[PDB]
Amino acid sequence: GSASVTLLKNTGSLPLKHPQRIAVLGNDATYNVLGPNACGLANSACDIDNLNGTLTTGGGSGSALSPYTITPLEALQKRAIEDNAEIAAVVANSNTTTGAEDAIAALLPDADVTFVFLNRYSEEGADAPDFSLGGDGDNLMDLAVTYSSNVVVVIHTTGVVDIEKWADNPNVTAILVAYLPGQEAGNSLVPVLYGDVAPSGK
Amino acid sequence: SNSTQWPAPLANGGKSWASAFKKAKATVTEMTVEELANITSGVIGLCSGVTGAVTRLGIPEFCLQDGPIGPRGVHGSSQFPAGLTVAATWDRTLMYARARGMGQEFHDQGVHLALAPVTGGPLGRTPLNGRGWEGTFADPYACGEASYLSVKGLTDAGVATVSKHWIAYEQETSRNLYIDIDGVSQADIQLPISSNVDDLTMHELYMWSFAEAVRAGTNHIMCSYNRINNTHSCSNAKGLNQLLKTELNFQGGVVSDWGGQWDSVPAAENGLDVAMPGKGFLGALGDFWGATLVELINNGTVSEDLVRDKAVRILTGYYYLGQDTNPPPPFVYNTIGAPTLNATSGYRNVRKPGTAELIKEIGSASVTLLKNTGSLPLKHPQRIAVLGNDATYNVLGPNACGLANSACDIDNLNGTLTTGGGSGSALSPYTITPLEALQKRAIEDNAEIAAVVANSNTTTGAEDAIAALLPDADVTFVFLNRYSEEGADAPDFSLGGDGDNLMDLAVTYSSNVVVVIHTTGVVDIEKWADNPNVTAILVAYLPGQEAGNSLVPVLYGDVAPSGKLPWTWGKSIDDYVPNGVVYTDAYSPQSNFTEGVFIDYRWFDKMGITPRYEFGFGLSYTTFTYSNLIVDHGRWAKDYSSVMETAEPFAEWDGTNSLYDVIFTVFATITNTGNLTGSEVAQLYISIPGDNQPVRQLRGFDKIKDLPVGDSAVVTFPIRRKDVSSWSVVDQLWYVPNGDFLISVGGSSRDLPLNTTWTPH
Numbered sequence: 003g004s005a006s007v008t009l010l011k012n013t014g015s016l017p018l019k020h021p022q023r024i025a026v027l028g029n030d031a032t033y034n035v036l037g038p039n040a041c042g043l044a045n046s047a048c049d050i051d052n053l054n055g056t057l058t059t060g061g062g063s064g065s066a067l068s069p070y071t072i073t074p075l076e077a078l079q080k081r082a083i084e085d086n087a088e089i090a091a092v093v094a095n096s097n098t099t100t101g102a103e104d105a106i107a108a109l110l111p112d113a114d115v116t117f118v119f120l121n122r123y124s125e126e127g128a129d130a131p132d133f134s135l136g137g138d139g140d141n142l143m144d145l146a147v148t149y150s151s152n153v154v155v156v157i158h159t160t161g162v163v164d165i166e167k168w169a170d171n172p173n174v175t176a177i178l179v180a181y182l183p184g185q186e187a188g189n190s191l192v193p194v195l196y197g198d199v200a201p202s203g204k
Numbered sequence: 205s206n207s208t209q210w211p212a213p214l215a216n217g218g219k220s221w222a223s224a225f226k227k228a229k230a231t232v233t234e235m236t237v238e239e240l241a242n243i244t245s246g247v248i249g250l251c252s253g254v255t256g257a258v259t260r261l262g263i264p265e266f267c268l269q270d271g272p273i274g275p276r277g278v279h280g281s282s283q284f285p286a287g288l289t290v291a292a293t294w295d296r297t298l299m300y301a302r303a304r305g306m307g308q309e310f311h312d313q314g315v316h317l318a319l320a321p322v323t324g325g326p327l328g329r330t331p332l333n334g335r336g337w338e339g340t341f342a343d344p345y346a347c348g349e350a351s352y353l354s355v356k357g358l359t360d361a362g363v364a365t366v367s368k369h370w371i372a373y374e375q376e377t378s379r380n381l382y383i384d385i386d387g388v389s390q391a392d393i394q395l396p397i398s399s400n401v402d403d404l405t406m407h408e409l410y411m412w413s414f415a416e417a418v419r420a421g422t423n424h425i426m427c428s429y430n431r432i433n434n435t436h437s438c439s440n441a442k443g444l445n446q447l448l449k450t451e452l453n454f455q456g457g458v459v460s461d462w463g464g465q466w467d468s469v470p471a472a473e474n475g476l477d478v479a480m481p482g483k484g485f486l487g488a489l490g491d492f493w494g495a496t497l498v499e500l501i502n503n504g505t506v507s508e509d510l511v512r513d514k515a516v517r518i519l520t521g522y523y524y525l526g527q528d529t530n531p532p533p534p535f536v537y538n539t540i541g542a543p544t545l546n547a548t549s550g551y552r553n554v555r556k557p558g559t560a561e562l563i564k565e566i567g568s569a570s571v572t573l574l575k576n577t578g579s580l581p582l583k584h585p586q587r588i589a590v591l592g593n594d595a596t597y598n599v600l601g602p603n604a605c606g607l608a609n610s611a612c613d614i615d616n617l618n619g620t621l622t623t624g625g626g627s628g629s630a631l632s633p634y635t636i637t638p639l640e641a642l643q644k645r646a647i648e649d650n651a652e653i654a655a656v657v658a659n660s661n662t663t664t665g666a667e668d669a670i671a672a673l674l675p676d677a678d679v680t681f682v683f684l685n686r687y688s689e690e691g692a693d694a695p696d697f698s699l700g701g702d703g704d705n706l707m708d709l710a711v712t713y714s715s716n717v718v719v720v721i722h723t724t725g726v727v728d729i730e731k732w733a734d735n736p737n738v739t740a741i742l743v744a745y746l747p748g749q750e751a752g753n754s755l756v757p758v759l760y761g762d763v764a765p766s767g768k769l770p771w772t773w774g775k776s777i778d779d780y781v782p783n784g785v786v787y788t789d790a791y792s793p794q795s796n797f798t799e800g801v802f803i804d805y806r807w808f809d810k811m812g813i814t815p816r817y818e819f820g821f822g823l824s825y826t827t828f829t830y831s832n833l834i835v836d837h838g839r840w841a842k843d844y845s846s847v848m849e850t851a852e853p854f855a856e857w858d859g860t861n862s863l864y865d866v867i868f869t870v871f872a873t874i875t876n877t878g879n880l881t882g883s884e885v886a887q888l889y890i891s892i893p894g895d896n897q898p899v900r901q902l903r904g905f906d907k908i909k910d911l912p913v914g915d916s917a918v919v920t921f922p923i924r925r926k927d928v929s930s931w932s933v934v935d936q937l938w939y940v941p942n943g944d945f946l947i948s949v950g951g952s953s954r955d956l957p958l959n960t961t962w963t964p965h
């Protein structure tokens with residue numbers, strides 16, 4: 003994970019120093035709400051709108067079960083606590099959950115950094131129709147750039163996605179792609195974000 | 205109502221605030237009328253309330269800030285466990301340290317007056333009370349002890365306390381704070397519930413805790429929203445002028461609850477000293493003093509001296525705590541909220557090293573084991589299932605529900621209930637979720653762990669995920685909660701969100717279900733409490749920010765559970781004091797406290813009703829055997845320790861003595877007779893003789909720490925003169941009655957292996 007996470011954009015926001023107020027966005031930052039193995043033997047049987055959490059692997063016969071997932075939020079919070087900082091995550095569906103937009107609007111302005119975790123599930127037996135982000139990713143980004151000027155994007159994905167609407171936004175200070183990191187998702191990522199190891203994936 | 209019958213005595217400064225009073229006189233003596241009205245009424249500011257400055261005389265604005273778990277609406281602080289949770293520790297060291305820590309965060313955030321603690325209002329009379337959780341024990345003695353130490357902690361940090369809510373504030377329904385915006389006035393719709401309380405009940409039940417608060421040196425007291433005998437508490441002359449200011453000899457200021465003042469002139473005469481919020485909250489909650497009191501004084505209705513005594517009471521605390529020569533810093537957060545106040549916020553980090561660890565410790569000292577068939581402590585389980593949104597975060601963030609933890613949608617998944625709703629809440633820098641802490645330990649054991657943390661009823665596939673996960677799990681944890689808030693009482697004991705459904709599913713698919721309850725009060729677990737698939741039940745109350753990491757070490761047996769219930773857990777709401785909350789549309793709603801002193805376990809004991817889990821009940825991973833009860837009448841001692849003195853009359857007074865002298869001490873021995881190290885909260889109950897008297901009253905507790913297997917420890921209970929007395933209605937004084945006092949000692953209110961009789965004069 004640490005050797006592969008790929009830094010695509012950085013205007014000087016990374017590595018992080020010791021930020022004191024940290025905002026997180028996206029269900030990808032936390033657990034599948036039905037459990038890491040809820041989608042079944044092929045990681046492909048959860049409902050179309052289910053919040054699957056961190057995309058640690060793809061769908062179909064080349065997936066596998068997981069004894070746990072070390073979520074980005076957990077790993078970010080651990081480091082926040084070491085710096086005596088505050089951290090808060092909006093991890094619901096930003097379109098369909100009552101109060102989610104307002105919660106994001108109220109959270110992001112005072113944060114020193116805001117992390118948006120995006121994903122794009124794909125699977126055996128079908129091709130992706132386009133490069134569009136999975137779930138509410140488009141809307142998370144739209145909201146993130148509206149309410150914050152230090153947005154750091156992390157993408158867990160099976161392939162290339164469409165970030166054309168935001169990659170040249172002056173409020174997106176950094177972008178990374180972490181691909182499909184397996185069970186150690188958060189703890190492989192956070193040391194790169196905080197500069198313990200320089201990213202080296204390409 | 206009658207302030208000729210019940211006149212207002214003048215502040216003199218009492219025992220510890222003599223130099224402070226002297227300074228207060230001097231400064232007040234130089235003030236104009238303009239200036240008396242400025243400090244005696246609230247003004248617009250960033251704090252919950254702000255007094256007007258006396259800026260000619262160098263006297264700044266006092267920040268009055270919520271609440272009883274620490275400064276509310278503030279970033280850069282810690283979320284402490286609620287009062288209910290420290291109560292469950294039965295640990296005086298933790299009660300003090302908790303408040304001392306809140307205290308430093310209050311002072312360092314720039315707060316002069318903390319709107320805290322809750323010191324016996326509500327106490328309380330109903331287990332449905334929305335904000336009962338803000339208090340501590342449902343018992344006058346134990347509430348009294350924790351009240352003393354809470355005020356002491358806050359004052360020792362340099363923050364003045366406003367102990368609340370005086371008095372008989374025992375329901376949120378129809379509390380009816382005064383509002384008067386455009387047309388709609390609360391005066392036109394419904395008066396506040398009237399608590400109608402006899403003289404004995406008021407003395408032996410509700411005043412007890414406030415008497416301890418006064419003795420610890422509360423600088424101020426908040427008068428409550430309810431009426432008493434159909435007169436508002438904030439303008440009750442019997443209440444404020446006589447009972448508090450004469451009999452309790454209270455030398456500090458009475459601060460109105462926000463909308464607790466309804467009159468101008470009765471309030472001024474009958475004991476109120478500060479009008480809040482004043483110009484705050486758009487003047488909407490009444491603005492009955494300010495320029496109106498300026499007019500009332502120099503047209504002859506309200507005495508000038510009377511209003512000078514009010515400002516003296518306010519300023520005493522200022523000088524006593526050294527706020528003149530060691531001022532607190534600027535308060536930098538907008539805690540009111542737009543659109544009511546449009547103002548920006550700065551930032552200040554106030555979290556000290558040690559605070560996080562203390563909060564953790566309070567959680568581990570309070571979590572209360574109610575059922576154990578032998579599944580706990582855990583060994584090294586390899587497949588772990590977790591049920592409940594309470595096991596993880598609020599899906600919108602820890603603070604999503606706003607400045608009072610109460611603005612989230614009715615169906616929002618709020619995560620771990622680490623605190624309650626309302627002005628007693630506080631923001632959180634993070635939450636250490638139960639799931640996070642359980643997973644950390646599972647990973648140490650090379651185990652696997654999966655949580656279903658969605659709403660189990662409304663989320664597609666949630667029920668099927670649960671059914672597929674549970675059968676193969678070695679242990680299944682179910683996390684449940686029940687949010688309640690200020691401004692409404694719970695309708696019943698039912699669990700919040702999907703709690704009932706989670707339990708039905710859990711017992712269907714697993715025969716090793718461990719239940720953990722985060723709650724503001726008693727909940728209904730009757731469907732599942734006797735199901736043998738439920739191998740253990742624990743109540744964790746409201747643990748604050750360190751929820752998960754306080755809990756898991758108990759579950760895994762690094763520390764034995766040690767907390768005990770601070771109220772009674774009855775099988776049904778119908779088993780409690782009747783008319784616990786009165787719902788009516790009648791203009792003048794009435795609550796008659798016809799039960800008298802018999803609330804919580806006193807009611808249960810008198811009516812012969814067995815609770816599921818009694819007052820003072822909690823299991824350990826070991827057992828304690830009691831022996832060798834000793835009453836040492838030679839072990840007496842004069843009351844020197846208190847910060848302030850009351851003037852409570854009593855029969856045995858001779859010039860020398862006090863109602864709070866310790867007149868004997870009782871001792872007992874506990875031996876750890878199980879197979880693991882454990883702490884034990886020993887308890888002492890006394891049956892005071894008399895007519896219509898409680899079967900048992902708590903008069904002592906002592907927590908022995910980490911007693912090894914086979915070892916013994918001596919447990920110690922000082923008994924004050926007041927602890928053995930009754931209030932005489934005829935003679936209007938306390939007295940030690942004649943007859944037989946049974947002194948009972950053991951591990952709970954219904955497990956008392958040791959007893960002896962004491963017969964006085």
Ligand SMILES: *[C@@H]1O[C@H](CO)[C@@H](O[C@@H]2O[C@H](CO)[C@@H](O[C@@H]3O[C@H](CO[C@H]4O[C@H](CO)[C@@H](O)[C@H](O[C@H]5O[C@H](CO)[C@@H](O)[C@H](O)[C@@H]5O)[C@@H]4O)[C@@H](O)[C@H](O[C@H]4O[C@H](CO)[C@@H](O)[C@H](O)[C@@H]4O[C@H]4O[C@H](CO)[C@@H](O)[C@H](O)[C@@H]4O)[C@@H]3O)[C@H](O)[C@H]2NC(C)=O)[C@H](O)[C@H]1NC(C)=O
Pocket residue numbers: 400401402403404432433440442443933934935936
């Ligand atoms: C809300 O409402 C309630 C109900 O109205 C108020 O409760 C009342 O409170 C007052 C105190 O302000 C009590 O007054 C005292 O009453 C004494 C006599 O009591 C008997 O009176 C009637 C008989 O019809 C009954 O109400 C009482 O019955 C109740 O109590 C008994 C005993 O426990 C129970 O068994 C019953 O079931 C009832 O619950 C009594 O039978 C009276 O002696 C006393 O007078 C002394 O004190 C006053 C004030 O200091 C002096 O002015 C006066 O001169 C007397 O003092 C002299 O004598 C003594 C020695 O005897 C000396 O020590 C003194 O130096 C002095 O020389 C007083 O009038 C009233 O009884 C009580 N009622 C109830 C039902 O509780 C609440 O206060 C009120 N609360 C608020 C906040 O407003």
Ligand SMILES: *[C@@H]1O[C@H](CO)[C@@H](O[C@@H]2O[C@H](CO)[C@@H](O[C@H]3O[C@H](CO)[C@@H](O)[C@H](O[C@H]4O[C@H](CO)[C@@H](O)[C@H](O)[C@@H]4O[C@H]4O[C@H](CO)[C@@H](O)[C@H](O)[C@@H]4O[C@H]4O[C@H](CO)[C@@H](O)[C@H](O)[C@@H]4O)[C@@H]3O)[C@H](O)[C@H]2NC(C)=O)[C@H](O)[C@H]1NC(C)=O
Pocket residue numbers: 041045046047048049050051052053054061123124127128129130131136137138
């Ligand atoms: C959490 O995780 C969940 C899983 O655990 C995620 O849910 C899954 O999400 C995926 C997409 O993200 C979803 O995919 C399928 O949805 C339906 C299901 O029935 C299908 O229609 C889709 O397949 C079609 O579309 C693809 C792109 O357009 C295409 O590559 C694919 O081959 C297929 O198209 C054929 O079918 C159409 C006929 O209706 C034709 O119009 C089309 O041209 C293609 O025709 C070919 O095949 C036909 C046979 O049917 C044949 O008639 C024709 O001749 C020709 O050969 C799509 O794969 C999963 O269903 C969904 N799983 C569940 C259980 O709902 C979830 O999204 C994730 N959450 C988040 C937030 O990301």
Ligand SMILES: *[C@@H]1O[C@H](CO)[C@@H](O[C@@H]2O[C@H](CO)[C@@H](O[C@H]3O[C@H](CO)[C@@H](O)[C@H](O)[C@@H]3O)[C@H](O)[C@H]2NC(C)=O)[C@H](O)[C@H]1NC(C)=O
Pocket residue numbers: 238239242247255256257258259260263264265
């Ligand atoms: C009656 O109460 C009023 C509100 O408390 C008070 O007005 C306030 O006076 C204080 C001075 O104590 C001012 O505070 C600040 O003033 C400047 C602002 O740049 C600072 O340099 C100072 O350090 C100080 O912090 C408030 O600005 C002022 N508030 C308002 C709304 O005017 C009255 O003066 C009081 N009146 C009397 C007669 O005592």
Ligand SMILES: *[C@@H]1O[C@H](CO)[C@@H](O[C@@H]2O[C@H](CO)[C@@H](O)[C@H](O)[C@H]2NC(C)=O)[C@H](O)[C@H]1NC(C)=O
Pocket residue numbers: 605609610611612613614615616617618625687688689692700701702
């Ligand atoms: C999560 O918290 C919210 C408040 O932040 C709860 O919503 C309130 O619930 C009470 C009943 O206890 C209602 O009378 C209020 O009107 C609700 N408030 C709002 C603004 O809707 C909510 O019930 C909690 N969620 C769960 C699952 O218990």
Ligand SMILES: *[C@@H]1O[C@H](CO)[C@@H](O)[C@H](O)[C@H]1NC(C)=O
Pocket residue numbers: 147148149150151171172173
């Ligand atoms: C960048 O963020 C600020 C608020 O931080 C917002 O006002 C501005 O419109 C944003 N700009 C873009 C291009 O998203």
Ligand SMILES: *[C@@H]1O[C@H](CO)[C@@H](O)[C@H](O)[C@H]1NC(C)=O
Pocket residue numbers: 496499500503505
């Ligand atoms: C005194 O001033 C008050 C407040 O303005 C006013 O209501 C009252 O009528 C005045 N005169 C009296 C009571 O004689």
Ligand SMILES: *[C@@H]1O[C@H](CO)[C@@H](O)[C@H](O)[C@H]1NC(C)=O
Pocket residue numbers: 711712713714715735736737
């Ligand atoms: C207890 O759990 C088992 C499955 O492990 C189930 O068959 C049984 O019906 C349950 N019993 C009760 C009384 O809930």
Ligand SMILES: *[C@@H]1O[C@H](CO)[C@@H](O)[C@H](O)[C@H]1NC(C)=O
Pocket residue numbers: 400794796
């Ligand atoms: C409350 O008190 C009096 C008895 O003194 C009684 O007349 C009144 O009706 C009572 N109210 C209710 C609702 O029972």
